[PDB]
Amino acid sequence: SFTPANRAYPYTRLRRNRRDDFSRRLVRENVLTVDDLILPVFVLDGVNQRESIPSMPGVERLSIDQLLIEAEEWVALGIPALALFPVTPVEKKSLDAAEAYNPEGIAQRATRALRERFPELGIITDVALDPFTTHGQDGILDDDGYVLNDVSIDVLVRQALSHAEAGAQVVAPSDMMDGRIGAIREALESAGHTNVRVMAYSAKYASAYYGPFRDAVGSANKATYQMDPANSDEALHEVAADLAEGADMVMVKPGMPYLDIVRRVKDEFRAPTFVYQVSGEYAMHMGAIQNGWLAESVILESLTAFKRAGADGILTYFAKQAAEQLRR
Amino acid sequence: FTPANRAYPYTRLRRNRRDDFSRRLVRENVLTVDDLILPVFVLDGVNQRESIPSMPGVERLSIDQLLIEAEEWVALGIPALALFPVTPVEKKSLDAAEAYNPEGIAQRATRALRERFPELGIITDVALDPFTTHGQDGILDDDGYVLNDVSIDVLVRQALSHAEAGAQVVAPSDMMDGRIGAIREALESAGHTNVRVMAYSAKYASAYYGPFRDAVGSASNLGKGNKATYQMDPANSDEALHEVAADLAEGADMVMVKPGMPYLDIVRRVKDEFRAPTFVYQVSGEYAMHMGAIQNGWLAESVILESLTAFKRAGADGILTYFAKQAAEQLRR
Amino acid sequence: FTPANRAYPYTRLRRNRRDDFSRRLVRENVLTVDDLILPVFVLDGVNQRESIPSMPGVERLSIDQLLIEAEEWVALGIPALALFPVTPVEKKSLDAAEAYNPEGIAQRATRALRERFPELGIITDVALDPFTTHGQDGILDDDGYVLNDVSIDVLVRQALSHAEAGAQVVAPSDMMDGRIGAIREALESAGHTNVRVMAYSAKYASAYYGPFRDAVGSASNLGKGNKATYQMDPANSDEALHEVAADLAEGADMVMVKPGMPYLDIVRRVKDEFRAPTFVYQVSGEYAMHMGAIQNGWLAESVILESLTAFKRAGADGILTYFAKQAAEQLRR
Amino acid sequence: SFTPANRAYPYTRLRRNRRDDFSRRLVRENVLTVDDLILPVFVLDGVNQRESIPSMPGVERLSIDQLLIEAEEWVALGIPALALFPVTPVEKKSLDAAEAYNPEGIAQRATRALRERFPELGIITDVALDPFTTHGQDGILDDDGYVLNDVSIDVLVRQALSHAEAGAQVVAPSDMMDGRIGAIREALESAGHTNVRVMAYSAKYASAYYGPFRDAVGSANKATYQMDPANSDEALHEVAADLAEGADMVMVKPGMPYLDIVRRVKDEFRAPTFVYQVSGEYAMHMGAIQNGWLAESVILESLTAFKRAGADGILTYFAKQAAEQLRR
Amino acid sequence: FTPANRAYPYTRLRRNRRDDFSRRLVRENVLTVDDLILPVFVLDGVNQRESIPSMPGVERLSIDQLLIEAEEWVALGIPALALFPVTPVEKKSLDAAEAYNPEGIAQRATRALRERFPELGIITDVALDPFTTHGQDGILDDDGYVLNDVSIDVLVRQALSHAEAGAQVVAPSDMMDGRIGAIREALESAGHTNVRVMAYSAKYASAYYGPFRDAVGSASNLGKGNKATYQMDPANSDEALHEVAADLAEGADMVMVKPGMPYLDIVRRVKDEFRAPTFVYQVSGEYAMHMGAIQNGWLAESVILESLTAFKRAGADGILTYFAKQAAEQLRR
Amino acid sequence: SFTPANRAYPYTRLRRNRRDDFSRRLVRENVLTVDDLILPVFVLDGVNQRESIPSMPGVERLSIDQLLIEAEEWVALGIPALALFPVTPVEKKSLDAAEAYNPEGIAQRATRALRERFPELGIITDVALDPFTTHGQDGILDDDGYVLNDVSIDVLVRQALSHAEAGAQVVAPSDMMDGRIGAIREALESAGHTNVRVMAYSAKYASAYYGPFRDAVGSANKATYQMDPANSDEALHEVAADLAEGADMVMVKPGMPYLDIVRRVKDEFRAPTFVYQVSGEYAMHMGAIQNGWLAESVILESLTAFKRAGADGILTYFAKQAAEQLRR
Ligand SMILES: [Cl-]
Ligand SMILES: [Cl-]
Ligand SMILES: [Cl-]
Ligand SMILES: [Cl-]
Ligand SMILES: [Cl-]
Ligand SMILES: [Cl-]
Ligand SMILES: [Mg+2]
Ligand SMILES: [Mg+2]
Ligand SMILES: [Mg+2]
Ligand SMILES: [Mg+2]
Ligand SMILES: [Mg+2]
Ligand SMILES: [Mg+2]
Ligand SMILES: [Mg+2]
Ligand SMILES: [Mg+2]
Ligand SMILES: [Mg+2]
Ligand SMILES: [Mg+2]
Ligand SMILES: [Mg+2]
Ligand SMILES: [Mg+2]
Ligand SMILES: [Mg+2]
Ligand SMILES: [Mg+2]
Ligand SMILES: [Mg+2]
Ligand SMILES: [Mg+2]
Ligand SMILES: [Mg+2]
Ligand SMILES: [Mg+2]
Ligand SMILES: [Mg+2]
Ligand SMILES: [Mg+2]
Ligand SMILES: [Mg+2]
Ligand code: NA
Ligand code: NA
Ligand code: NA
Ligand code: NA
Ligand code: NA
Ligand code: NA
Known part of the structure; x- marks a missing residue:
């Protein structure tokens, strides 16, 4: 913990280290590098296609060919990984979310193309049903319109497996279903995908900051699975479970509104810890x-x-701008 | 923390989330009007109201207008205001003497509010840059550096002038070392036994302060000194603990982290380690980007x-926020 | 630490190691040029460069040559130098008066560097053995023991002479008790408010110092006193905590562990317990054995x-290393 | 943790205990003894054979008969244990590392000879595939040249069992395969080798300090299994797993470059903790x-x-010199 | 502590116990001669040796005989002796003046040993009851209670007399509050900078002291006051922490728990919490019952x-034990 | 942990509370009561029989009828429980320790008699093979004379079951076999003895203090199962295992020489913690x-x-004398 060691003014003046650039640089506790950045990207179905997003100034949805073009620069800048978010055509959406595990779905096609052209670039696929349901809900619904936990997991598992088959180095289960990390881990292990990483969205909150992302993917009761913003202790139980279930990395979502949670998670578990600077955070700043x-x-x-705050890696729409500034 | 071997499917964390009633039962934290402090920008003159373009919905107010608006703030139960005077250009000087003028805006406003609304807390701002022509946060040496101890001598006089005006709380906001102890020693020696000191303990060198600078007219002075010689490097977490430890030893009744949302980990650490009344400023940049x-x-x-x-x-007891009225209204309902 | 019940095959720690990109994402620590301090050996005279056989690739340099080499150090972004003068035999005395001579090598070098490279940090060495004929680390009593408090009186004058020469940091390296407080009190009383003190807090009685002794010409004095009466026993870990606690209470802005790699557990303990700016010296022996x-x-x-x-x-903020230039160059690329 | 107890100069002067030899001796926190030393030894195939190692001055590879001769002195000095490293003849190397479990391999022959002649001397065998593969990689390779985890473990298990049968009191799995301690423990238990110790190389780093050892054994992407030097938290997860899997002792490797890791491991787990002062550390000092x-x-x-730093036992090429100095 | 989910049969704790070599490897602690302090009972006169019936094998020795025996103690490497004079009945007084007599037994013995065996540590006993006629541990008020501060004034003079005789360590054994600070302040003011103070910090009101009382002739004085007004209640553990914290703040170089084996939990707590040089007395009762x-x-x-x-x-750095010679001999072999 | 709270002389004088009996009584941190005492008793085979023990002055071995007589006073004094140690006739000793589970063995006969006459008195039986082996070793021996772990447990399990059948409320496994608490717990549960307590000898050291007890029971390499006196951390692993395996109470043995272990065990586990003041401790004091x-x-x-130190209950030959003094 912490021992003040009886430090007292004027013997201690904390301004001394702050006096000159060189001593500020020497005591600086943390530094951001390109190694910390993951770029989320919205992926379109077509060819030679780009769309602007009204609520995310400066961000484009990109067809896979355009994605490959932009990725040259992202790789040249040293961005270690992309997080892919497909923009599913409405005709492919269904009650059973079958498009989720379609070997020729956007996510799968995009992954295969990137793994071939940029073998060193990390590809993080989104394991989630809501891009694929007609109702845009985060899973399969019962009669009451409630998201079924275990039935939704059965689909997520097939989806994760389709992503491993496409070559994804990381799968990222983002829908807040209980036990899903374990089920996905069981399935990856049984199929022989030993080295496919699982990046769990562990402490994901029922947040108003997700607005612009819903515009981005075309999807504008989450309180029955996403976490109540008021709760901190609860996030520790979420992370403990995902680690026991086999996650290689755990994430807190939203980011800046939840920096205390990032701190608690890294302090308690000492595991690889990620944080999502969400679309609302990007749009507010931009x-x-x-x-x-x-x-x-x-x-x-x-x-x-x-x-x-303790994060190892950051999912941020600012990743290219940040990388550029860090270099130059 | 002990996980207690909780495991799916025996443990399903969605069960408590299933219904509103159970979400309400387990909810770990609630915001109330008791948590809110409203900062207000104060003009000289009479019947003055000025909109701030970089802070949509915020007005600078002359004192007469402040008193009128304060009726609604008190009616909503907002516990305190933090006063920020908009100092006329002509009253800025090398020596920052306006800081301790009994007829300065902050002193006049404090006296007016204390008389009109005796139960409303008034938190005055103990700082020199509103009163310096160069806009730096203290008195400059011949190298253009802010002199720590000389600045404190001016801050002390100003804090005393606030106590004399009736302020229940003084909040020293310029990041001079040892200033909490010096101000407290002066308050004690003068008999102002119960004047609270709200220390800006861990206050960072931030780009989120832009709109406040527009509000008080300081933006064009930013380049004329280096705030990094006293404000904290955003990279530094451990250092905050040392800032707070010193301010508590020196007599602060409340300690504060500034900026707010970008520093929620610091709020957490400070509350966890010291278990003291802990405050956080949701700064002008944060308000502006949300608005x-x-x-x-x-x-x-x-x-x-x-x-x-x-x-x-994150652990805050109170929040200084330009959203205080909007929040109290929603609360309220 | 909570293991969180992680178990093979659900947990396979090789997955993150599989690819460079994921290794990069989870990498816990990085070295940068901001972490580097270069120690330099300083000769009297002009156009002097001398190779040190026990430190391959290290040269002692006269001041003119130091300034020339410093251009490249600054260009690489190395934040500071630690200066170690090579005192002429004739300027050694019983009273170590050369320590505080305004025309001593350290003072002249500091003045030259501060003028030529204003942003480069200069860390001077506050110590008496470079200036004593017997080569012991302070003033001797009639039993041949180093007098603690009398030595401090000389160290204080020397630290003041460094502050007057412009040094941003003084680093008291002789292990006298209470010396941090005495030097700080003197700096404060004289107005050197912002002169940093980098304490050699946990400095051990080590065989790894051999080559440095060759560099500064002290090797033949080693037998003439017992360093174990002030330098720490290599066996002692808990004792380091008490050394550091005292130096922090006495006003050190930075605390240091010496030797480096053989004492990485001490760096860890010191950083964990005090959360203060923590420095480590990768000493001449460590450089030599690697080279x-x-x-x-x-x-x-x-x-x-x-x-x-x-x-x-291990937790260090900065590293004093004879590899600083080689490291900065690789970094850099 | 730690309470400074308001100790202040001049009431507290830490030089007082340092004043005289007797008080230095009284407060001395730690002492090295011969009980702490384990001697690694490079073992040749022949008879009446010794070889000098260019990058390890003073260290000889020894045929088993020469090993038996030298062991008399090591036992007389009180060195509790040897760590055997066979120098495998190139003709015995293969893609399947079968020599690893050969009952007449060097390690097995050496163990039987030493267990008979010096029944009280600890013998620690090396459970590793790289002395036995043609490619010198630390396991069985797939098409891509990647070291297969679980297939490599199957060989390690047979090897560990062959060492128990030869009489080894300790087996030391040194190749950084996930789950291997558990698999080896399962196999030893099922075979009735209840008391065979497992000394896990738990926190073994991807280090440049291993250079001279590769010269010693004749073997001059490890980053896919050996730990990144930058990582400390990760070492705790490695040790926690090996303890749960049944290791009787856990090791940090390299040694002096990783003393902070030694400290964290001993502080967190309070288990028997070992450290390897590797060939590069020896050569640097020598x-x-x-x-x-x-x-x-x-x-x-x-x-x-x-x-x-917290180590109970040290693997060091300095073990005989150290033992001699400690005695005389 | 984290159990790390270790479970039979994967974990069998008998495996490390199977052989001597593995038991040796994992052995957590070893005793060495460096850990031993021998207490010795010192007679007046010449050619005196007296057996102590309640302490079989222990002799009281005149100084000449002590010097002879000390040759063997030094040869075995025993680092220090703790001296306990057997004060002649005639030299006891109300004012305990014999405590600071330069010709007292403790002072004479210290001078003799320091000359004959310069490297042997001498720990003198700072206490008043060997010198009072009533045998209580200090100076009595008119109610028969030991006056705290008045006793300290005598203890200070005695500690100074020990420092003048050459003792490297003084060990204040009478449980007066604040005595460590007072003795340290006196030593410092007089220039005895390096005289160690070994505080009897957590010393309990014990029945295990019986045989020592026989050794020094105090047994018949026990009923004439109440040791429970300064010695600790055997029931109290938390209280020991406060005793030690105070002695460390007051300048003790070493802190001690007394009795030993019956208080091993206290040794543990004291070492764990303070991480300071920690000593334990295996008292006369403990020796006697073992013998x-x-x-x-x-x-x-x-x-x-x-x-x-x-x-x-349990965490002790050093042990005061009447078995020191027997132990060193076995060690040794 | 601990905060000194800047307490300083003369503001703080710790002698103030020590000044008067009443304030000493008020602050007294701990008090011994009869509820803390368990009396070990040596039980003979005959009728109207008592024997004196040379190395345990004042202690008698007692036939069961004499035991019943003495127990009236022990119950009247409020001693909650006895720990029975049978003195097995040499003719009943064997290589297979079968007498251990004899329904008419001394321990079983004694238990049935006491449970009937004093239904409220706790009876703690000794689960151990050494009173029953010809060789007096603590289990079944292999060819090398080593005590077999798992084979010894099979006998202990039958013995524990025989004690439950005789009515023992507590069984106390004293032989340091690994995993024995779990095996005994499995067996008690499967047999329906839900409420039979298990008092584990968890941290039992290889001690010289056991001398007089060996005289008492007629039995005068333990280092291969009993703990090395030097080891403290190890005791935590012993207790953690016994708690996980189902012990209701855990014990440290010897007592006063191991008070630091008592402290660590109670602090770490916060479980019912017992300590044995062994025969050597009694004899030394007596x-x-x-x-x-x-x-x-x-x-x-x-x-x-x-x-x-933290003990809830104490096994002590001083139990009757202590009880008497506590009352009067
Ligand atoms: Cl200043
Ligand atoms: Cl400021
Ligand atoms: Cl001195
Ligand atoms: Cl030194
Ligand atoms: Cl008194
Ligand atoms: Cl006393
Ligand atoms: Mg979703
Ligand atoms: Mg979950
Ligand atoms: Mg980090
Ligand atoms: Mg300001
Ligand atoms: Mg401050
Ligand atoms: Mg602006
Ligand atoms: Mg709160
Ligand atoms: Mg020196
Ligand atoms: Mg010091
Ligand atoms: Mg040399
Ligand atoms: Mg760091
Ligand atoms: Mg290998
Ligand atoms: Mg592993
Ligand atoms: Mg150790
Ligand atoms: Mg006394
Ligand atoms: Mg005391
Ligand atoms: Mg007696
Ligand atoms: Mg120790
Ligand atoms: Mg037994
Ligand atoms: Mg056990
Ligand atoms: Mg209790
Ligand atoms: Na990172
Ligand atoms: Na509040
Ligand atoms: Na740094
Ligand atoms: Na050891
Ligand atoms: Na010791
Ligand atoms: Na009890």
């Missing part, structure tokens, strides 16, 4: 920068906060 | 209470 | 960055 | 001593550091 | 090393 | 009291130490 209300320097400051 | 996104239709209004709930969950 | 093995072809060059990464993993 | 750059006293100082 | 049982043939001689190993396992 | 070297008050002081 909106204030374009309005000329905040300096562009808030981008790096916001990312530094994640590192200081 | 901009809400006005754009990019974010639902519900993000306001989500952002404030976060401060409570 | 000797690399030159022999017994070890790959990559051991340099491995050794330095270890300091970061 | 090179500087022979160059006359460092006093021979660094040997004892380096070993003292392991004790102070 | 009696060994002489009876009820216990094997091996219990001696078992009892001493316990002190090391 | 010998010094009879010699007139120590006051009889050491008896209470020695017992107080166990309470202060």
